[PDB]
Amino acid sequence: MGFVRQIQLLLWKNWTLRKRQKIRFVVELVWPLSLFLVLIWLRNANPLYSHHECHFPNKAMPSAGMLPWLQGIFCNVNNPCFQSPTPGESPGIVSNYNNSILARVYRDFQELLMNAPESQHLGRIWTELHILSQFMDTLRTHPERIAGRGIRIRDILKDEETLLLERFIIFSQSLSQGTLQWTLYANVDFFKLFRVLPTLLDSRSQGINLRSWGGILSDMSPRIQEFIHRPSMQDLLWVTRPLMQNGGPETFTKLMGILSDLLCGYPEGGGSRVSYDRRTTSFCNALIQSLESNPLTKIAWRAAKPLLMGKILYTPDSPAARRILKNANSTFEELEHVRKLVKAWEEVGPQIWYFFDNSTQMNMIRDTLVKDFLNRQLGEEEAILNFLYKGPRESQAWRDIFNITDRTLRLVNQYLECLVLDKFESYNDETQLTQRALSLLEENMFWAGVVFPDMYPWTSSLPPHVKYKIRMDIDVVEKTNKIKDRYWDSGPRADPVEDFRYIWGGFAYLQDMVEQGITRSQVQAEAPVGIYLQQMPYPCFVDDSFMIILNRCFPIFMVLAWIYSVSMTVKSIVLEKELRLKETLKNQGVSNAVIWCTWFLDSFSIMSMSIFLLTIFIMHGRILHYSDPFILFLFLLAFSTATIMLCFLLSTFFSKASLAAACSGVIYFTLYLPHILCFAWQDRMTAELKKAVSLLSPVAFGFGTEYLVRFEEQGLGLQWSNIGNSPTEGDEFSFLLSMQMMLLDAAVYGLLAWYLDQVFPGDYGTPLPWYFLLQESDSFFEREHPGWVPGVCVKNLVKIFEPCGRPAVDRLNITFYENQITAFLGHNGAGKTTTLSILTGLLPPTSGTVLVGGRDIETSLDAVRQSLGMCPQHNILFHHLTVAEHMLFYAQLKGKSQEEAQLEMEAMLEDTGLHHKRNEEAQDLSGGMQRKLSVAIAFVGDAKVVILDQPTSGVDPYSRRSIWDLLLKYRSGRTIIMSTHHMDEADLLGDRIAIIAQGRLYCSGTPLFLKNCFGTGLYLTLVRKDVNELMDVVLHHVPEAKLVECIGQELIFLLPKHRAYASLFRELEETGLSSFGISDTPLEEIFLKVTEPECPGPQLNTGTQLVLQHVQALLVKRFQHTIRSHKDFLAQIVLPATFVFLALMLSIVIPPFGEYPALTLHPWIYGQQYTFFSMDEPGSEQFTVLADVLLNKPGFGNRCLKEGWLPEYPCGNSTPWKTPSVSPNITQLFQKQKWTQVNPSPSCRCSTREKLTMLPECPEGAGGLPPPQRTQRSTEILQDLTDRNISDFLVKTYPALIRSSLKSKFWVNEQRYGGISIGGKLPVVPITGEALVGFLSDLGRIMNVSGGPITREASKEIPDFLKHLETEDNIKVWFNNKGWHALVSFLNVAHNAILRASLPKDRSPEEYGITVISQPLNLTKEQLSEITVLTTSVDAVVAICVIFSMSFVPASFVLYLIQERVNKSKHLQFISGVSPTTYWVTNFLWDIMNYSVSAGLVVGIFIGFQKKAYTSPENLPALVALLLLYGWAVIPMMYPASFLFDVPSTAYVALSCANLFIGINSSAITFILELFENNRTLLRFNAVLRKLLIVFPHFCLGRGLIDLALSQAVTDVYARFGEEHSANPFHWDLIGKNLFAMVVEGVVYFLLTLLVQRHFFKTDILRLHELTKIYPGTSSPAVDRLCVGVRPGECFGLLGVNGAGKTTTFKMLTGDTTVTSGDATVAGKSILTNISEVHQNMGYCPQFDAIDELLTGREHLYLYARLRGVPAEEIEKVANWSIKSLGLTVYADCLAGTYSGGNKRKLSTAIALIGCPPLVLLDQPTTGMDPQARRMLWNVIVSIIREGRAVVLTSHSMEECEALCTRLAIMVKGAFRCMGTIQHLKSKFGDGYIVTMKINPVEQFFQGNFPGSVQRERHYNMLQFQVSSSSLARIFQLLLSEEYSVTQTTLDQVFVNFAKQQ
């Protein structure tokens, strides 16, 4: 139950302390919500994009004819989406190329010219022309009548008459004209005719057909003119305009567009697109080289070359293979027939030129014709526009149509000869084929390599099941080890380049050719069926653009937000431990488990609020949109628990906070590194190995975060229904396993932390054995009175400290009895605190035992601590609480009611003198009040043993009275142990006394026993203000000894005969010295008997030697500091480089590279699946059998042959056709409302703006009714889609099918991959074969060409040529591109069915088949796309790790600067004169050489791993200059921060985190924003940021480390193909600009730190005038207006009550704090204006030790001599004098941090006197010094006062302010109360004779003898008494009966009642 109360109190304290910060807390719970702001914005920069449907054009294969094959290659290069069903996916069409102008032209030509009433008589004209040219024109070699000649003759003959002429000649050139001319009317006029048509004049089989030739042209006149003006011809001529204009169009910009709309037609704009070579011609190698070396067409040529010019290598040399590949080269045969035809031109051309130059039928017929009749004949429907425009015979400027023909038709012949059309080479082994392929690959002249495995080189007969292989290289083939993607994306997979490697790589074409060869080799009656391929359409979907960066940034940004919390809690666990605040709590009796429970609750309650805020931002910021808030909350909660218990585990390794701040973040982030292995071993990990590694909590976090992201990139969330099932196929270890294996780690970490705490409590506390689970649960010394009881007992201790060697404590034997106070005295290095640290469990002994209640602490500390109280020598308080809160907290921890605690606190506040504060923080107290509170809270509660040492060192004589009252009130029932130095109280209130010397007792017992043990006598005191006089004056009554002590302004005499003594004092009274005082024997004389030069500085250096001495001094100081703390150096310098080393070592382990397997291609590589078919175009025989042999007899493919196929996929039976039943609502819906042909079914609603979905909803009216189904023997479901809209069915049914796949197996699946569709016709050119060649032959015979030798070969192959450009009857296959190997599988299905559908009717088609196999060529490679992404992914994280590492080193230099700024050790060096510039410059110079070691170590690692892009002969200087100049730039940026943090560890943590935040969120935003080149507003931001963000060195390093890595991948990919460009990474665009910004920054920030340093920094000396100091938070002044002056040779006093303003004055004088309204002058130089000038005329000794705890005592003196003049050859004797004079010989070199606490004061005053400054300021120079050392200090001060130097002291011991001081000044709250000499005070204040006795019976003893008395005190067996000035005290001394004592007046009693009265 008390457990719960203590929990509540601890939590109350923590939350009270947090109520004061309100900034360390807000930053604490806001820091993680800050790494996500970039993502929150960058999400809303990119709203989601919804994509329309896609419909794609089909692809003809080589077997579909050459013309559509090539046309499809050209038109469908980019594979465009069309959004509306293309014509090719209609039941009986394949064409898909209308709206092409070249096709509409044919449409109009068939519609108008031909098949009409104008083409009837045209052939008759041709036939009559041929008859003419055969009969009348050709009349030379044949016999005829006289009227005949090759040109012209006359038949004039048979003349019987004798032999006007012009008239007849004109007239002939008339039937009734010659009849009346008369003879010639009976012989030559018999059958004569006129000039009419003589076409009837010949002897011909037909009568005549003339007078119709010109009378048929008018019929077809309105047809041609109509045609030419049709819109199709307008478009043709419009687009052909920029072709013949001067020859040559623009290369690939508009030429492609013209050819596109000329051949292709695609609408809506063209779719969306989602060395001297040998055996060649000097043209063909010039062309290829000009094409390859043009950096614009190298890419397309790189892919097109192996098909145009590559070669195909086939393995065995057998007649079977030769036959197959003879039948497979049909395509190349019909491709070289074209070359033949075009080559025939080089022969026909000159013949046509001649015929149209000379002709008997043109140049002698048409040039000879006359024109009178022609003009009228033309006009009745131009000779000048015809017979001259096209019939010229001599040059005129007809050639316009002939000299473009050769230009355009010989260039084509030059082009076509570059093709290689013989490409089948024959080998005898796959090995030989492989080496020849290796040879050919470099030239890029390797197509595939075909292998027939089952046939031997003698094979002749084909088996009826042929299998072959196509072996290509991996860069043009899909991988054969996996068949799909790892995760189901939502897209069609339709990128023409990287998703269609089976098409542009040439695999599918060769497979088609060889399947057709195999079919044609064993059928002999093949069906001419061709094949088209069609891609199944895809619905509308939603694009992301975001989960490409989200999935690569989420599980870094999520694990990196907790690094600040981890560091701030591991550091806070360790501050309490090494600041000793855990041990005070454990001393007040707080259990050990309450500590841990409070830590856990207080950490959990703070992490749980940032968890909440983080979830709210993650969801409402739309980073995750589909998931569940509650599950995310619970996941983060489990992580919080794991991380907290990890922090508890880590805190038990460290003891110093600065060391834990430097390791916690690095270790937290190095436990996450094993997630590098997820890049290479992505698939070869197992759920069991995944469990084994998830014991490290961050990797379990990463495993869970990946599922969180992935369930969303698959369109779902983390709903409560799919935790336990992974998204990826066939892997265990779901999300729940990560969540559940976080809690196992929480438990394990916590349990181990609890155990490991007990065994290794470093540096404060007692360890346990590693097996503590065996469950234990004369004479010097006074005679011992057998009475009271013993309390604490000590028995033979030893404590050896390892370095020092000597025993600090050596065999003690003491007992402290119960009901009394003991005083525990000794010199300084005695063992008083080392012993009292052992009685309490602060540190373990080397030997011996102690016993508190008879129970030894070696086993029973828990019970001992239940009743303890303690105050330590140096204060430890919660520096932000209050006085009242301290006392109200410790009182209740012991267990008390709240109101009783109020009462006790109220009493003790007044009792201790700490009232009037009661509300001030424990840091605004002075240093005596802190020591006073530290005692007050040792008595509160109720202890039984109270151990309190040095309880009064620093408290003024007026408050020591209250402390004594407090001690004597609680002595009643406790054992109290006091350790003290000043002896006024060691005897007054000590019931016993013990003394230690060198770590063991020297004496013991009650004080009276000690006195007679050593000696006793009176002590005559003569306080002066000449020795010979006194000596002779005390010779008259010469006793024992004489002068025993004589220091400045003091004296001492010892004298053991009433008249003798009586006469002395009496006579002395009336007869140079001032007052005096006799006594019995002090307690300081017996303690004093137990234990038992450089006055000028000549020539202090100055100038450049002084500066060069300062630099050396500081560098040596820093070297000494860092040699002795090497764990800190290791953990701050070498650790980050080790982190980098681990990160690079991990990215080296990679799986070995095997080889790509076989993978027989068939549709059952996939699982259960649907297929379909569609028997379009029925009734045609030869298709009713092809639709029968792919359903019923063997079915699809080869999974059911007669013998067997692959005994891995067994058959079975089938089921009857069965149309499934549908719900009635559909039945009424589809018949009720009338639909149409273009709208068969209701449409699907997409993913609305506010209705986000992955795929549309598609209501219950999808593409129709369910079609008939069946289950085939292949264990597949094919559904018959005959006479239905397939494009509608597939599109509107894909979504509902994708949902029905994750109900059972939670991973989404694709259940449909393809199907056949029998039918499809395209119209073949109606022109037959032999008819064409006959027409050509007749035309040639008319036109006198006769051809030539080439033409007979060219025109020998026309009939077969025209049969191979079209097919007219063919099928088409549909495929789904999501499955990689789904194209070739179904292509094989189709070819195999075509084979079975055509073999004869007695061969049983169930045992014939073809199978294909892929098997890449053994080149030992990977695909480029794989290694590129792997390399960039790995080499990004290396840059991330280097940035993380170099972000921690720069903050490591602030630890020393902050550590020195507080404790006032930097100010104490400025006092010696170091001129801030040299200090800062030297620190910078040390930091640089400290940094360069880490930089060099990182570089050495990069060299060792041989990482390119970093260690290459062109990059290494760039890397070195990046690192070495980043450090220069960034180091002087931490320095201004050392001015506002007080705890070094806090600064370390808060600066490392800020550096990491900037260095991550500057070098990722500009690499993400540049990735998005789509958006235009992003480029503005990217450009402006890449310049604004240059002021941070973090950006300048983050850019460069990733640039040098990106700009080497782009060259190592070039090495794959082509040339190899170098880097030169120094350009003013890569890193050259950053390296310039570094240098400017590195010198602008240093000036900023030197500027911020400046905002913070008569015959007498030190004249003070009215000066004041009001502290900011109060109302009354700390130091009111005060004014003095000190002369050269005096010593000022500066006494004062506790809390009066004495250290504030010294702080203002030395220049620490800021004066308020005053002035002060040291040697003429004022302190307000020029203070660097006064600083060299004074020394300073602070109240608190300002020393470096790691050098030594001697190295301090050397440092502080060098920081002054004292040239290099004198420092040794100055140091030796200072060491010897102050008493530091035993331990002059022992690590000043191990001094005792009275030796630290000696060191401080020793280094306050180096040099010889005229003014010396000392502040409490003697608080922990024993009486032996105080005298040595007094002697030194007297020796320096005698020179002429001034001293100012501030002390609280009045034994010395009257021994060496000349002027005093009591100082109450503000200014002074009473200045003046010592005698000026005593005389006016206090008569004298303060008689003190020891012992009612003595109270009445001063009734008549001494009436005037006034009582001072009434204590225990000691009490004081003031008696009036009677001078008869020694007279009445014979009336006593005790401790004799009387004195004139001590200054101690004067100061008590001086301050009593105010």
Ligand SMILES: Nc1ncnc2c1ncn2[C@@H]1O[C@H](COP(=O)(O)OP(=O)(O)OP(=O)(O)O)[C@@H](O)[C@H]1O
């Ligand atoms: N940082 C501070 N803020 C507010 N008040 C302060 C601060 N430091 C000191 N004081 C107050 O100013 C007064 C002067 O304190 P100062 O340190 O001069 O006392 P002191 O005489 O040096 O004490 P002691 O004599 O024990 O050394 C004290 O009352 C103290 O409470």
Ligand SMILES: *[C@@H]1O[C@H](CO)[C@@H](O)[C@H](O)[C@H]1NC(C)=O
């Ligand atoms: C040309 O294509 C159009 C486009 O739909 C089609 O309607 C027409 O039937 C086609 N003409 C043919 C193939 O002759």
Ligand SMILES: *[C@@H]1O[C@H](CO)[C@@H](O)[C@H](O)[C@H]1NC(C)=O
């Ligand atoms: C036609 O081009 C040829 C070049 O092949 C040229 O010699 C001839 O002169 C051109 N025709 C005319 C009419 O000039």
Ligand SMILES: *[C@@H]1O[C@H](CO)[C@@H](O)[C@H](O)[C@H]1NC(C)=O
């Ligand atoms: C190709 O590599 C595979 C890898 O195992 C090996 O089995 C096969 O024999 C090799 N064949 C050739 C022709 O290199």
Ligand SMILES: *[C@@H]1O[C@H](CO)[C@@H](O)[C@H](O)[C@H]1NC(C)=O
């Ligand atoms: C559709 O028909 C079903 C019966 O199958 C009926 O329950 C429902 O009310 C009808 N209307 C709808 C679903 O809008």
Ligand SMILES: [Mg+2]
């Ligand atoms: Mg001590």
Ligand SMILES: [Mg+2]
């Ligand atoms: Mg002080």
